[PDB]
């Protein structure tokens, strides 16, 4: 009962309302979606989505722990907060997805597969987010939390939907992320069927996809390895007006994709693996010695160092 996740995976109720300390309340807007302090007229609005892939449980446990503390009065909440346990069936079964990768059904893509239960879910989550952010009068933030089976040179990294030449870009966000422990950021301006692109472009939110580490079943996550994100998120909800100690860009490498559709790499090759100059299939060929392979699967993208402009 005191467990938000437990309730979200069973849907004991459906639209009930849980009383919260300080006069607040937790309202279930839909299965696995709970809004807290939504009535906060002019406070910052934070969307925390997790479990888009059911096997990535570390962020799920982290988010559940925060919710518990808010209900126990151990953690203060001064933001409008909407938490979404995304793929409920996948989370309950402990798998990436049932019939289709949900982080490929967003941005409206679900319309191409209107029969899949995960598409229906993705459409419902898009609307909820859209309505949540439409009521925002201050900052609009969205962190879609992931973990991954495939290792990475930069264990923790973010994917940043860079849009409109960064006219609404916040370097403080890059600072906040670097403080969270993010070791690298992937900038992309082109459209994508991800939840962070959707909220970024459709809801005009500062949205980021965060790859926080290794995928593990529930009970096998070392939450200590997520202290950075856990501390930062708690601090955001507690006091969103806290200043951010700038960003020493010297330790926050930025990358961008130069060309996709990229086989000649081991099955367990790590994300961000540098490709040596003159390598067949980095026919696509490596050049310079600064390009890196990302999200490989024989189908992958070749990235390069980027700079803000």
Binding site feature residues for Zn(2+): 53, 56, 146
Q: How far is the CB of 181 from its own copies (least distance, A)?
A: 25
Question: 164 or 171, CB closer to its own copies?
Answer: 164
Question: 117 or 288, CB closer to its own copies?
Answer: 288
For 198, left (φ over 0), alpha (ψ -120 to 50), or beta? alpha
Ranges within 188-207 binding its own copies (CB under 8 A): 189-190
3-state secondary structure 181-213: CCCCEEEECCCCCCHHHHHHHHCCCEEEEEEEE
Binding at 53: pick from its own copies, Zn ion, none (beta carbon under 5-8 Å per type):
Zn ion
Binding pattern to its own copies, positions 279-298, x when CB under 8 A?
A: -------xxx----------
Q: Does 146 bind Zn ion (CB under 5 A)?
A: yes
Binding at 246: pick from Zn ion, its own copies, none (beta carbon under 5-8 Å per type):
none
**DSSP E strand boundaries for the chain:** 17-19, 25-30, 33-36, 45-50, 80-85, 140-148, 157-161, 185-188, 206-214, 254-259, 273-274, 292-294, 301-305
170, 206 Cβ separation under 8 angstroms: yes
Q: How far is the CB of 303 from its own copies (least distance, A)?
A: 14
Residue 290 in tokens: 């600064």
Question: 24 or 105, CB closer to Zn ion?
Answer: 105
Residue 130 in tokens: 């859209």
First to last CA, the chain: 49
How does strand 157-161 pair with strand 292-294? Answer: unpaired
Question: 12 or 287, CB closer to its own copies?
Answer: 287
Work out which of 19, 23, 217, 309 binds its own copies, going by CB under 8 A.
309
Ranges within 154-193 binding its own copies (CB under 8 A): 164, 189-190
Residue 146 in tokens: 């992931």
Q: How far is the CB of 274 from its own copies (least distance, A)?
A: 14
Binding-site members are: 53, 56, 146
Distance between CA atoms of 10 and 233, rounded to whole angstroms? 26
| Residues annotated as part of the active site | 211
Q: Does 53 bind Zn ion (CB under 5 A)?
A: yes
Distance between CA atoms of 254 and 247, rounded to whole angstroms? 13
Site residues (CB under 5 A) for Zn ion?
Answer: 53, 56, 146
Site residues (CB under 8 A) for its own copies?
Answer: 164, 189-190, 277, 286-288, 305-307, 309
């Amino acid at each position: 009962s005191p467990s938000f996740l437990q309730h979200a995976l069973s849907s004991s109720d459906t639209r009930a309302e849980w009383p919260l300390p300080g006069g607040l309340a937790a309202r279930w807007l839909a299965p696995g979606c709970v809004e807290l302090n939504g009535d906060a007229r002019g406070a910052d609005s934070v969307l925390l989505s997790c479990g888009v892939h059911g096997n990535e449980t570390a962020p799920i446990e982290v988010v559940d722990g925060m919710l518990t503390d808010i209900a126990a009065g151990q953690l203060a909440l001064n933001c409008r907060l909407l938490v979404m346990f995304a793929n409920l069936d996948a989370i309950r079964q402990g798998v990436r997805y049932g019939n289709y990768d949900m982080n490929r059904l967003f941005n409206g893509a679900h319309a191409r597969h209107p029969e899949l239960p995960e598409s229906v879910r993705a459409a419902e989550l898009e609307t909820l987010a859209a309505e949540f952010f439409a009521g925002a009068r201050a900052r609009k933030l969205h962190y879609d939390l992931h973990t991954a089976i495939r290792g990475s040179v930069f264990e923790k990294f973010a994917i940043y939907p860079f849009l409109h030449d960064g006219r609404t870009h916040k370097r403080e966000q890059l600072a906040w992320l670097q403080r969270c422990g993010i070791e690298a950021v992937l900038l992309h301006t082109q459209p994508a069927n991800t939840f962070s692109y959707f909220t970024s472009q459709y809801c005009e939110a500062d949205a980021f996809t965060l790859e926080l580490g290794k995928a593990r079943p529930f009970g096998q996550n070392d939450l200590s390895r997520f202290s950075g994100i856990d501390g930062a998120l708690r601090g955001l909800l507690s006091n969103p007006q806290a200043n951010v100690p700038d960003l020493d860009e010297d330790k926050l490498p930025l990358f961008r994709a130069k060309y996709d559709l990229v086989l000649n790499l081991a099955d367990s090759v790590e994300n961000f693996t540098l490709l040596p100059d003159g390598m067949l299939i980095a026919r696509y060929q490596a050049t310079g010695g600064e390009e890196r392979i990302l999200f490989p699967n024989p189908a992958g993208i070749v990235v390069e160092p980027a700079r803000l402009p």
